[PDB]
């Protein structure tokens, strides 16, 4: 019943809020992470060695896979601004 227009600008509509939600999730995220780093480092000093060790090894993980939900959502917008038609 509706026309293919009708459907594709549909399909636009939830293309544009799915893109930015996934979005402001990625940033809530980086946000936490970057405030807890603050509050470990504080001390960091005064852990014992081996716990030390840890940090570094446990800390390079979570950045790298916070980072990888950064780079999907980059990707993601540039794909759907093309399908647009738009190349600026």
């Given at each position: 019943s509706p026309s293919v227009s009708?459907?594709?600008?549909?399909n636009f509509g939830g293309l544009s809020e799915g893109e930015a939600q996934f979005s402001m999730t990625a940033r809530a995220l980086l946000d936490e992470?970057?405030?807890l780093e603050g509050k470990?480092?504080?001390?960091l000093d005064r852990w014992d060695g081996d716990a030390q060790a840890?940090?570094?090894n446990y800390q390079k993980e979570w950045?790298?896979?916070?980072?990888?939900?950064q780079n999907v959502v980059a990707q993601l917008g540039v794909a759907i601004r093309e399908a647009h038609?738009?190349?600026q």
């Open positions: 009708d459907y594709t600008r549909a992470l970057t405030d470990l480092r504080a001390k840890a940090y570094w950045d790298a896979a916070a980072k990888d939900m038609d738009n190349y």
